[PDB]
A paper describes a structure:
Via genetic screens and functional analysis, the osmosensitive Ca2+ permeable cation channel proteins were identified in Arabidopsis by two independent groups, which was named CSC1 (alias OSCA1.2 according to the OSCA family nomenclature that is used here) and OSCA1, respectively. OSCA1.2 and OSCA1 share ~85% sequence identity, and they both can be activated by hyperosmolality treatment. In addition to Ca2+, they are also permeable to monovalent cations such as Na+ and K+, suggesting low cation selectivity. Members of the OSCA family belong to the calcium-permeable stress-gated cation channel family (entry number of 1.A.17.5 in Transporter Classification Database), a subfamily of the calcium-dependent chloride channel (Ca-ClC) family.
Here, we present the structure of OSCA1.2 from Arabidopsis thaliana (AtOSCA1.2) determined by single-particle cryo-electron microscopy (cryo-EM) with a nominal resolution of 3.68 Å for the overall structure. AtOSCA1.2 forms a homodimer, similar to nhTMEM16 and mTMEM16A. Each monomer contains 11 transmembrane helices, in contrast to nhTMEM16 and mTMEM16A, which have only 10 TMS. In contrast to nhTMEM16 and mTMEM16A, of which the dimer formation is mediated by direct interaction between the transmembrane helices TM3 and TM10, the dimer interface of AtOSCA1.2 is exclusively formed by its cytosolic domain. Despite the separate biological functions and low sequence similarity between the AtOSCA1.2 and TMEM16 proteins (~11% sequence identity between AtOSCA1.2 and mTMEM16A), structural alignments reveal that the last 10 TMS of AtOSCA1.2 share a similar fold with nhTMEM16 and mTMEM16A. The ion conduction pore of AtOSCA1.2 is in a closed state in the solved structure, as revealed by pore radius analysis. The conduction pore is constricted by a set of hydrophobic residues, which include I393 on TM4, L434 and L438 on TM5, V476 on TM6, F515, F516 and Y519 on TM7 and L575 and L579 on TM8. We have also identified two long helices in the cytosolic domain of AtOSCA1.2 that lie parallel to the membrane plane (named ICα2 and ICα3). In AtOSCA1.2, the hydrophobic linker between the two long cytosolic helices is identified as an unique structural component and may serve as a sensor of osmotic stress. In the structure, this linker protrudes into the lipid bilayer as an anchor, and its partial deletion impairs the opening of the channel under hyperosmotic stress.
Numbering used by the authors:
A (entry chain B), B (entry chain A): 3 to 48, 70 to 276, 288 to 717
The structure:
């Protein structure tokens, strides 16, 4: 379907450059300066179409770290890791595997019983290599030449990030983070509050340091009413400022009264339940607190060591950041966390079940050649030499992207059902859930449940006879669908995101209908963070499509390369200019990303075993079992030598930065800075 | 072979009671009071044949803990855990599975092609149940009724040991252990010694507490010469005290001179290389030290947390005990440890290879019925109705025990090749190595490489036809060999060890030939510890033989029960009276024992799957895959809720015991107690 892939990529490229032209025109308007330069406003300072790509590369990395942050820079380093990995894989896959496969005409042996393709398998892989053949001694050493070298890149980068983290976090500005420990669970007592329990624990066990504890209020209903009150005042602005350019009888459902008396009701509830939260309710005081110390060393001790007999009471997390704590999940009791997880492993098992139907509905539309040759009817979807290319190359990608346009938000809500009192861990487990959802339905339940449609004459006319051989041929045949998915979802989806329409339309609507001046900068935060819910494991999906199909057909490799090369420039321009970073992690997600790339390697070799086990290659599988040993052993090496720069904060640097801070500024209290830092953002 | 099993067990029992009579006679001699009551001498105090079993049960467990120790009591609790587990397994295996199997005469259908047994499979298991049958719905729920209940016992005991440990170690007497941390690796420097590196590290990072460091001398050659000097003075005592009851021309090889001038040579070397060890040799000062603190809290902090950037420098162990530190392995450089491990995984792979031949040489002797019916010759080993029982029931156990009479010492040496600077971890990894050696050669390479001999007519006359079915029948047929191995190795081996001949003969020889008085108490320590190299994973071998054959033939279960019931009384008498305990761990080996029993459970269900997959039991395997999920999930539960009472010493108890000790005795230094505690036992 190269006649189809060319048309699909042509539509995608000649729409993506339309997006670039629209961005180049619409950026230079003077009114949208608050949109496309919003982070510059957040830092407190007010023909030649693509003349922004060289501007986004002039700024060096340490100035970017001191300007943007440390999460987004290493997020760019994910894309540079992708460009580093897949360049020589594609180089050694062009000049080696393509002269191997183009020679032997085994799918020109097509009138073996029913296998009809055209002029693409001659560029494809092991399907074109016949049974028990001699060509496979190429691929396996190329397999080594892929998985030894990518482990070298994954070692070198994961060295240059732990060093990068330890250089950053031992020199960043003082937060009220590095002195504070969450004390998540605590046993009840006949004492009148949790506060004296935390006092008589930490005065006895940490008698020297112990700055000031702070318990966690419930405040769920109160914050929900504050959110509803602000939303109601937003509509009270909208309906009332329609009247300032109109006449009497304003609204319909006297009627402007029908929000302001509701405002009086809500304020009468606000003052009541804000009075009735910290006066008469010890019941609304959850068993948790934010303790605090006067050295970073003491908090580093307190939040790494076992505290008591039970490893369920007094357990200490690292107290994320006061602008990072996802409140209204500190109000979940601890003993009901493991229930809420086991619920959302079941419903996730449903989300890998209900979404199989919109997967297969794609591929039946994507391989109508696999239906026309398998079922005689042509007054329906018919070969017309051009609309076949549209129905097989463009609409499957658009359809599969539009079925995925909601599920990052769904998995974000589903992670919010569990506790995870930080945005910085909600986004990590949301990325993990969307990675599993891409690995099951977008990859496996696409390939297995679609290649049966793609070779339906094989399963139809001659059943249960060569059913390993047909499904072994059909998996490298299903690279064209991922080519189109790259060219639609990744390619134009990163080439169309620059024109940030979903915040810009809302910004114009809030310009046109609000009150007055002195408010035109709260909506510059409406472009949120980088997509770590959305765009983070999409990268790992393309890593999976690269590494799985690297000893398999190299027609996914150059498209992955140009996607990475474009998205690096796109996201680097975005991180320089339009991004917020509502949390400093800092880059504490590489034990997840590195692990998922290693799991992509392991799945790559375990699927290469399945592809070599369908051509009766006898002495080919024994020289491939060494790789799931070698990669998992390399992962256990990296889990020991580099990962405890991410988990365990060492005490030498915790004392070093403390003494350096007491050399920079002496003689300031921390109680004026940090005693009232973790009070709920109601108060 | 019940006619053979009865004769084997009769010989073993009627020799074991001969051992008990010899012990009862030889104990009441007045001269061996230093042997069979040696621990009572170590604690500083000077018809009715089996009248010692009720005496060994009168003493309650807390007095035993305050008398013997805390390792040996929980070592007895291993045997009581065995008696707790396998009693209702045998009860519910008699009254359920034996009326199932005795009914259906499918091995009385014996003239299916070549299968000849006699009157034992009617008591055995799934071999006697025919293909795709209805009896198996018993066994699987009995499988649940074994693996749910044993996990309850493994939860309850592992609760009553972590509580037992935390009650003991938070109330024991003061050692110079709980204040001391080994600092195993340290980077070099242009500074003149490692001592100033340890000083300028710990004064800066732990400025409050920091009692006194102590570096580790090399002292290998010096300690080897001290050992040779003491051995040479032992022979200098022996040859000279032969002269005190003889005449001139004493020895042969003037000749008594031929040891005393060698003594002068050795002392001239001792004073030289003891002078030339701490004066002119910074090269002989290894990069390690024993740091020390003045609170237990500070040492608990120092030996749980990451120290620096690298997790290879300044890494901190727990500094075992000064009478526990296996010296001359602190003199191994750290960077050469991982080489020495990877050597001794290879040679261990050789020890699982060379010892296959003495395994199979046993079973060919053990199943001559499987050779006579498979190879016509009878002027060799012949059926004579009694010597068949001797050659099949007694000599395989004796032969297999005598091939194993050296390998605990071999694995002890092999663990000494690695570093492991404690006896308390050398014995743990020696127990792990001997567990793997029992699981591979004594269990798997016995069963697979012997059942082929046991059904050699099946593999001979009709080959490659029912080779899953024959090897599925033959594995429950190979329970009689483990019956005899229990009755020889375990049974009489624990019933014959009471008469502790290997220290007693040496004690009589050292009484007859040494110098004078004032020396008759150093040889009471010659009975060493409990067998944790030798006798610890023998228990787990019988756990494996119980749990694997519990849904399989219950003719191993009562013999395991009476072995446990006898060995509990035997080892409890021994631990009360004759044992030393050269190290207090205290019971820090249950994450190993609990893990190996859980692995025995997992191997039990994964071999039960293999036994059900040989009778074409279709709807029997799907209701058995849940158990390797359930047991490993239970192991991940116990690794989280109970294990960090063994690994991570909590800080609340470390401050509690410190304040209680300062309430018991105030105002004593630790430098008079602990500054010179870890100097090498040369000095």
């Amino acid at each position: 379907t190269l006649q189809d892939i060319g048309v699909s990529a042509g539509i995608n490229i000649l729409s993506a450059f339309v997006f670039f032209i629209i961005f180049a025109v619409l950026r230079l308007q003077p009114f949208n300066d608050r949109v496309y330069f919003s982070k510059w406003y957040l830092k407190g300072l007010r023909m030649k179409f693509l003349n922004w790509m060289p501007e986004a590369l002039k700024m060096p990395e340490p100035e970017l770290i001191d300007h943007a942050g440390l999460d987004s820079v290493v997020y760019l380093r994910i894309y540079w890791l992708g460009l580093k990995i897949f360049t020589p894989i594609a180089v050694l896959a062009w000049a080696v595997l393509v002269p191997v496969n183009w020679t032997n005409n085994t799918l020109e042996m097509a009138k073996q019983l029913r296998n009809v393709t055209s002029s693409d398998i001659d560029k494809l892989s092991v399907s074109n290599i016949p049974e028990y053949s001699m060509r496979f001694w190429t691929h396996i050493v190329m397999a080594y030449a892929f998985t030894i070298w990518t482990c070298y890149v994954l070692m070198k980068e994961y060295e240059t990030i732990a060093n990068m983290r330890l250089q950053f976090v031992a020199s960043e500005a003082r937060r009220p983070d590095q002195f504070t420990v969450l004390v998540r669970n605590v046993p009840p007592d006949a004492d009148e509050s949790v506060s004296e329990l935390v006092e008589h624990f930490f005065l006895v066990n940490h008698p020297d340091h112990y700055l000031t504890h702070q318990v966690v209020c419930n405040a769920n209903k109160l914050a929900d009413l504050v959110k509803k009150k602000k939303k109601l005042q937003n509509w009270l602005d909208y309906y009332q400022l329609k009247y300032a350019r109109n006449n009497s009888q304003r609204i319909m459902v006297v009627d402007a009264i029908e929000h302001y008396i509701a405002e009086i009701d809500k304020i009468s509830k606000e003052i009541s339940k804000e009075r009735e939260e910290v006066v008469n309710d010890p019941k609304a005081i959850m068993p948790a607190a934010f303790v605090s110390f006067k050295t970073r060393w003491a908090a580093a001790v307190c939040a790494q060591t076992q505290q008591t007999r039970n490893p369920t009471q007094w357990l200490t997390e690292w107290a994320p950041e006061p602008r990072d704590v996802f409140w209204s999940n500190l109000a979940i009791p601890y003993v009901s966390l493991t229930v809420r997880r086991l619920i959302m492993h079941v419903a996730f098992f449903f989300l890998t079940f209900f979404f199989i139907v919109p997967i297969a509905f794609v591929q039946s539309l994507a391989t109508i050649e696999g239906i026309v040759k398998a079922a005689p009817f042509l007054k329906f979807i018919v070969d017309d030499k051009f609309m076949k290319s549209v129905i097989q190359g463009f609409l499957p990608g658009i359809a599969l992207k539009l079925f995925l346009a909601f599920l990052p938000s769904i998995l974000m809500i589903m992670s919010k059902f569990e506790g995870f009192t930080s945005i910085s861990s909600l986004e990590r487990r949301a990325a993990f859930r969307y990675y599993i959802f891409n690995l099951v339905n977008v990859f496996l339940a696409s390939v297995i449940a679609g290649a049966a449609f793609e070779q339906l004459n094989s399963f139809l006319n001659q059943s249960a006879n060569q059913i390993p051989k047909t499904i072994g041929v059909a998996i490298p045949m299903k690279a064209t669908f991922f080519i189109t998915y790259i060219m639609v979802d990744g390619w134009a989806g990163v080439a169309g995101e620059i024109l940030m329409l979903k915040p810009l339309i809302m910004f114009h609507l809030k310009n046109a209908f609000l009150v007055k001046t002195d408010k035109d900068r709260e909506e510059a935060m409406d472009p949120g963070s980088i997509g770590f819910n959305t765009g983070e494991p999409r990268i790992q999906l393309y890593f999976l499509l690269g590494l799985v199909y690297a000893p398999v057909t190299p027609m996914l490799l150059p498209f992955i390369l140009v996607f990475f090369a474009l998205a690096y420039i796109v996201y680097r321009h975005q991180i320089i200019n339009v991004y917020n970073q509502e949390y400093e992690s800092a880059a504490a997600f590489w034990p997840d990303v590195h692990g998922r790339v290693i799991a992509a390697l392991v799945i790559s070799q375990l699927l290469l075993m399945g592809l070599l086990g369908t051509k009766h290659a006898a002495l080919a599988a024994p020289f491939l079992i060494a790789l799931p040993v070698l990669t998992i052993g390399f992962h256990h090496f990296c889990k020991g030598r580099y990962e405890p720069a991410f988990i365990r904060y060492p005490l030498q640097e915790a004392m070093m930065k403390d003494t350096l801070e007491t050399a920079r500024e002496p003689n300031l209290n921390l109680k004026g800075y940090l005693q009232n830092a973790y009070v709920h953002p109601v108060f």
